[PDB]
Subunit: 449 residues, 3 copies
Amino acid sequence: NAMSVVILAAGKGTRMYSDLPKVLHTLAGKAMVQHVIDAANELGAAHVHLVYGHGGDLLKQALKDDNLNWVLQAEQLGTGHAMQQAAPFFADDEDILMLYGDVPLISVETLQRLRDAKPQGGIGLLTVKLDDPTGYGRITRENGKVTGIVEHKDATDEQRQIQEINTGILIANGADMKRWLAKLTNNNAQGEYYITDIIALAYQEGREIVAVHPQRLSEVEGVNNRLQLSRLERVYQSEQAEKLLLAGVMLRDPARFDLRGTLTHGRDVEIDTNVIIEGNVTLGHRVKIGTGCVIKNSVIGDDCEISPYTVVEDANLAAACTIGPFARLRPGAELLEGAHVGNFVEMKKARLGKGSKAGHLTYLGDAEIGDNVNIGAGTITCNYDGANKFKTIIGDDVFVGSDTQLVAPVTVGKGATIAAGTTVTRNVGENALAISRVPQTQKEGWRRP
Amino acid sequence: NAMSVVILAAGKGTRMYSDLPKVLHTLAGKAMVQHVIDAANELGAAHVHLVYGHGGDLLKQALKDDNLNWVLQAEQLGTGHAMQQAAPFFADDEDILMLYGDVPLISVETLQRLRDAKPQGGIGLLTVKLDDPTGYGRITRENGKVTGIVEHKDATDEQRQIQEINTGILIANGADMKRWLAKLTNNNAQGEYYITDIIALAYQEGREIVAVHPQRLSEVEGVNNRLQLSRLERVYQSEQAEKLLLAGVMLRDPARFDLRGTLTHGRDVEIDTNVIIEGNVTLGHRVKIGTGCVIKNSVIGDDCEISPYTVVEDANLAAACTIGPFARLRPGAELLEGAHVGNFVEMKKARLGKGSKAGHLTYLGDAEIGDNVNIGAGTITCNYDGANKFKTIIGDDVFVGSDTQLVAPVTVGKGATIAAGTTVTRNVGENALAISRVPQTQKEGWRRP
Amino acid sequence: NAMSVVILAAGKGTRMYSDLPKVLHTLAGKAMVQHVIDAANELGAAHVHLVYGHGGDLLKQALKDDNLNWVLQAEQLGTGHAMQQAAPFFADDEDILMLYGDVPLISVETLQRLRDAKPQGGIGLLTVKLDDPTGYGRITRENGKVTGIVEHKDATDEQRQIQEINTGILIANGADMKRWLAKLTNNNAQGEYYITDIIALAYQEGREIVAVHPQRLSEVEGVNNRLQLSRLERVYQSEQAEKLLLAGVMLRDPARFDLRGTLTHGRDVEIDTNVIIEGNVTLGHRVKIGTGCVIKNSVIGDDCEISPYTVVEDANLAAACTIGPFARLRPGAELLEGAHVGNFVEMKKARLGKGSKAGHLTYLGDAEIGDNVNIGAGTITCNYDGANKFKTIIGDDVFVGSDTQLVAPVTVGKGATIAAGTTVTRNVGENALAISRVPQTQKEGWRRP
Ligand SMILES: CC(=O)SCCNC(=O)CCNC(=O)[C@H](O)C(C)(C)COP(=O)(O)OP(=O)(O)OC[C@H]1O[C@@H](n2cnc3c(N)ncnc32)[C@H](O)[C@@H]1OP(=O)(O)O
Ligand SMILES: CC(=O)SCCNC(=O)CCNC(=O)[C@H](O)C(C)(C)COP(=O)(O)OP(=O)(O)OC[C@H]1O[C@@H](n2cnc3c(N)ncnc32)[C@H](O)[C@@H]1OP(=O)(O)O
Ligand SMILES: CC(=O)SCCNC(=O)CCNC(=O)[C@H](O)C(C)(C)COP(=O)(O)OP(=O)(O)OC[C@H]1O[C@@H](n2cnc3c(N)ncnc32)[C@H](O)[C@@H]1OP(=O)(O)O
Ligand SMILES: CC(=O)N[C@H]1[C@@H](OP(=O)(O)OP(=O)(O)OC[C@H]2O[C@@H](n3ccc(=O)[nH]c3=O)[C@H](O)[C@@H]2O)O[C@H](CO)[C@@H](O)[C@@H]1O
Ligand SMILES: CC(=O)N[C@H]1[C@@H](OP(=O)(O)OP(=O)(O)OC[C@H]2O[C@@H](n3ccc(=O)[nH]c3=O)[C@H](O)[C@@H]2O)O[C@H](CO)[C@@H](O)[C@@H]1O
Ligand SMILES: CC(=O)N[C@H]1[C@@H](OP(=O)(O)OP(=O)(O)OC[C@H]2O[C@@H](n3ccc(=O)[nH]c3=O)[C@H](O)[C@@H]2O)O[C@H](CO)[C@@H](O)[C@@H]1O
Ligand SMILES: [Mg+2]
Ligand SMILES: [Mg+2]
């Protein structure tokens, strides 16, 4: 049936020492609250209600999911008060799932089990048994059935012995929720409005509350400071690394691999230590990635070998390309089949053709380079005049002597050769040798300072 | 006495998602099955029988140990059936040790203890007590003596309570083995031929089976998927790192060090984080290796300092050399005493003499450079004309101005100076200044675009 | 009241395989014994007595704290004998705290608690309960009170059951210490003089011994080999990383962060994996540090972004600078606001002005570069003539064409343009174009080898 989600993110993240709202701090390259929103949508949420207290401008800039209904909670008078701010927007005939904006690892599988356990006209509750339940809501039961929740501060010493605690996540019909929310009072230890009081209220009406537990404790851990965020980051990376290994991707050290986005891949891919994958990356079959590489929003074809310490962003490599070590590909870098880029070579908005090579100490920017081309060490395409950028065109079968400067815009015809140390300011004819050289001379018995 | 080893590697590695046979996947830069073969030979095996089912071409390409006897097992009808395929090759007077091709960490010390425990005319068995013995063969005993093995599938619930399980490794006389192997039947739960049935068969004959245990569980863990391979990789790296530390090598972080081959070393060597050692590497006394370096098949003399992010392969450094950070030495790179290579410098088949320096943005390929030489930033030896490679020779005491292009083949005489920005196409005399410079001129009030 | 500290560092570090005295091996970039000395001074020590046996020259070179009193212990006849060598220097009216030179993580907080527990005329003792107390001094008690210490070798089997052991750290009045030290005998299992015998001696006099425990076992762990040193290094890095996270510094992976010195910082600093901070580093607000960077003795202003694999030492960056990836800043490198240094760029004793850029394959050494300057790829300041270093001056608004060689000493006037491929040997006038170019020519139908 129909279901909407409410995410409470209006608390204050004091122990973060940040000018950025807590729920906006990232985990795996994505805002913590975005992880929660993705979970809600992945579960099938019709609407996602986001309850916030401040940093609204920043939140709105960062969060732009279409089905987001922004709900203000000016004063943080408790989770109960927060839900009251969203309640008017709940549909009487839909389920309402409540989540926290700072509990990023909640899994859709567990939420789905929770939805399934929710009884008609009742409440589905997510609980966990902890060795030390200190500080959390205690689940009370009567003849095995959940009858309420007692907050740590309000709980007696004996009640504090209860180890089954409230994760905070629960689900119930919207009309029922409105009914219970209207009856909340702040006559308790904290002097706030407890969303947890709706459990006793439902039980009193004869409705049943059923509790289900998460697969892992990490799923329901909340983040209040950077150290906690750090730990969840590791858990997330570890689980992703493990899935990749089980899916056939060889990671030389799963503890030294970070994925911050999406990784699409073929068979027999090998990834060495300390590699970082960002944004959306596609890897063909047998791609080998050497240690320390950083690859972002790029496409890498079959059989490519990316040598150590290579940085790649918004690049496209055809099959059998070899780049690095110490290569740097920037947006627009394109390599055709079998192309090669060596050490200390940078490419930006440049295309290197089939079997073409740029082995060293080179800059290729705003260029189109043909097939079977050899770019000597030290070559530079001078694409910028201080105000505009210009294109360099190199036809097939060209041999560029080392330390050549190509002053764009310029075109080098097919089959040409450019002598070492040339400054190319004009088009070069096909099968011609371009040169601008001073004959070597010599001064005898030269004494250095 | 005489002993041969049989390695069963004919099972199918389905959960690997690979086109490469499972036992060929590497651990520490070596095929898993090669680890097992090395163990067999290290223990003293006269012959090593390798039982395979497919990928024979790939296996034969990768494995080339002289004492390997390849045994085919076309249909995988069980470990018992696999041993029957090798049995005809067992000598009646030698011990036969059975190992698995996908259990890479088995230690020679444990195998040696197993050999020693084997009773005359009996069987030495390797067992381990697990908290959860699910899925493994259960060891049955009568008055403390091993009398048989019952496979998980064939075992009753009560028998499944037995926690001592079969690691799979065992040893027995060859003639005895042939005798028992001939009597195997496939009337069991799996409908296969269990090598494990020979335990009961030996006991029935009045022969004794003695069980010994491994030092660590990791020693007998098998690999069926990449995640399991990953874990064993870490265990292996951790133990190697620990031995190195105990041997006097300082690793700044043993969890961030990888050795894939052999490391020979002197005293007081310091290796920072994320260093990777491949093939055969020799390090003299007091060598210091900065973070992220990759060193392969190289020799590094006393007191060298390899700065951060330097890649080295098939290179030879004399004492007191300093290279990096961001230096890249390729095959044939040779540095004599006290030589220096700085950042963004690449060397290939090139020799840099005593106290000689190439501090920046340089390429030295196919060159012989004398002592007390200074190579300025931007210098390039143009060793390739598009079809052939040529040599560059630089005598002692030469000062090469920055951004010099040396067009090989060419020789620079001793004591020469090469002016900055020179293109050297001809030999330079001794103590002479080579130059090819356009005098600097100027155009007044130049307006850029 | 007054207190002095005695550090016993005269034992022999055999299992280190080093030519450097054991206590001089570093942990977090500092000698193990220096960690102990810092603890002593941090606690308020008037004098720090260092008892050594050899390597005195090396120790004296490395250790130079003003309040250090060097005490020789030629023969290592036991901790008791070692203390006797320092005793003559104890003041009758000061407390004497004994520490070990190879127990680097002892915390000042625990030492302070120990000082506070010391009873008038008695002894404060630091003890710990271990699961396996093997090899350590056993604490004996009578009616709950500490009455002595029995060394493992001298202890009976029943006494070896005692799990509360001596960490070795203790404190007592100096006059009392001298009194007890004079009565030590070497009639025991080791045939040495046990400092531990003073416990029974004090108890016999009617003085009381009070025991306090450390916060963590790591605090009192001693180092005898490199593997143990390694573990303490990790503990130290982990605790420092954790404090930084709690202080508001975001570390993408606290297990892959190393701090070897001091880190001062603003708010919202983000540090990616494998970054290493050395010496004294200051980071402004919102500084972002990409993976693998090494930063030493440097200052980094607000909003700077240091891209991957950048090495920085003794550099000063104003606000909003962007450098890397693969940039290398050496001592004296200074960037003014908004400056930019790209890949494969090296700077040494050079200043780059406001909004100035050096994006690629460049060397800037001994230079002063103005604001709004563009340094093209391949540019090199030739600061060295083989004997002397010279300065390069570039005024504001200069555009330097790529692959330009500037032969220092030289000055480029404000607003000038330097053509690509120029060798600049003379001053360039303001708003003028400097050039030294051979016009491009062409040879038809050139056939390569
Ligand atoms: C590390 C790396 O990247 S290696 C890969 C890149 N390789 C390089 O940079 C090396 C490129 N090679 C060169 O620049 C060479 O000097 C070449 C190709 C120009 C010369 O080729 P060579 O076989 O040595 O020819 P060489 O110079 O001796 O031949 C003489 C001819 O050149 C011409 N020549 C020499 N100098 C000049 C000049 N300044 N202007 C015009 N023509 C000249 C002569 O007029 C003569 O003409 P001809 O063929 O009609 O007789
Ligand atoms: C970052 C780093 O790698 S730094 C280390 C590497 N260093 C370098 O690249 C710097 C090298 N230095 C140079 O290239 C210099 O310009 C040098 C060595 C050639 C000039 O040395 P200087 O002391 O400045 O001499 P200067 O040019 O003023 O002397 C004039 C002489 O040069 C000659 N000269 C100048 N230009 C030319 C030319 N195009 N052709 C021939 N001779 C010339 C003059 O004929 C004159 O000859 P003379 O000695 O008989 O009087
Ligand atoms: C990857 C990067 O770093 S990109 C950023 C760095 N950018 C660069 O290195 C590109 C720099 N640009 C150049 O070097 C260009 O060749 C420039 C600026 C010198 C030429 O500018 P252009 O717009 O193409 O002018 P162009 O050469 O066609 O103009 C002709 C003039 O140059 C002069 N000229 C050309 N060659 C020479 C020469 N050898 N000696 C003297 N003057 C010359 C002519 O006399 C003429 O003078 P005029 O203005 O009075 O008519
Ligand atoms: C009364 C109540 O609900 N108690 C539960 C709550 O504790 P408790 O209320 O103490 O927990 P928190 O203060 O951390 O608040 C929980 C979540 O609600 C948000 N928030 C809170 C108050 C507010 O006015 N607005 C708002 O948006 C916070 O930003 C956070 O995401 O979570 C615990 C799990 O962590 C449960 O064991 C407790 O039973
Ligand atoms: C009947 C038998 O022996 N059972 C043992 C076997 O289980 P089990 O037979 O189930 O184990 P596996 O199927 O993994 O086979 C073990 C090894 O034998 C090889 N293989 C197997 C069958 C075949 O026809 N050819 C072949 O080469 C596999 O490649 C693997 O290297 O190992 C377990 C340890 O892991 C033991 O606890 C079991 O008692
Ligand atoms: C007799 C004595 O004191 N026993 C204690 C000592 O053991 P034990 O005496 O066996 O310990 P060590 O030999 O390691 O010596 C402790 C420290 O004293 C130094 N040293 C030792 C002897 C010497 O002549 N000069 C010298 O400087 C060592 O360099 C080391 O820093 O430490 C243990 C904790 O580790 C305690 O549990 C033991 O009760
Ligand atoms: Mg150049
Ligand atoms: Mg040049």
